[PDB]
Design a protein around this nucleic acid. Sequence first.
RNA 1: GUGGGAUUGUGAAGGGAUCUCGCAGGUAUCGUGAGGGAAGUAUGGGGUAGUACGAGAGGAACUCCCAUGCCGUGCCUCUAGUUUCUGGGGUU
Length: 135
Amino acid sequence: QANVKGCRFRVSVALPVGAVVNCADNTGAKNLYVISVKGYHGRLNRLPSAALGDMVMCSVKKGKPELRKKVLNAVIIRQRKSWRRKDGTVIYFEDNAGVIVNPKGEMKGSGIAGPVAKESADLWPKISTHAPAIV
RNA sequence: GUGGGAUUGUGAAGGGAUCUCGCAGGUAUCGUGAGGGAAGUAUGGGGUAGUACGAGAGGAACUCCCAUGCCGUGCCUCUAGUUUCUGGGGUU
Ligand SMILES: [K+]
Ligand SMILES: [K+]
Ligand SMILES: [Mg+2]
Ligand code: NA
């Protein structure tokens, strides 16, 4: 529940700024709009891009009105872009999904719909507890 | 000396003279390295450690280890993209 760039192997970037992904927890939000990604060091013209396990800054576009019109923190748990594990397997999900967390990584809400990537679960133990299945 | 050419424009075939040029290098490898260019640069995590310090609240760092951002030089085993192999099938 901290900086995750140095604790994770390279994962192919999936979600640049502006991507809208599903919200997999039961907070009340339906989707999340990616504003930025933590740990992004700048490069000219290059959009900040999120992948599995990344914390992102996001806003809710659809869902409970109490959750909208504000900047929140979320963690990516599923992505449609395929990445390659060190064991040589190339794997991808059917959808993109995120989960709303506090800046400390603690999961707001109490349940997760759909599976959770192992890369995301290893970096966020609180998210791994509520995962129906890992990878 | 020898070999090869030539001389100034109204003819031809012969003789001299006088000039210019060639006369020892070719061909194929392996190396030297003067000079010039010049590139790697950052972050996080583990541990140190809830330790030093501090009344408390708070709260570090180096050896070492593991990743990552940007940049650079390549490569095509995998994954992805691309098809005028119009390859093989469909279909109006
Ligand atoms: K030099
Ligand atoms: K120089
Ligand atoms: Mg621009
Ligand atoms: Na292919």
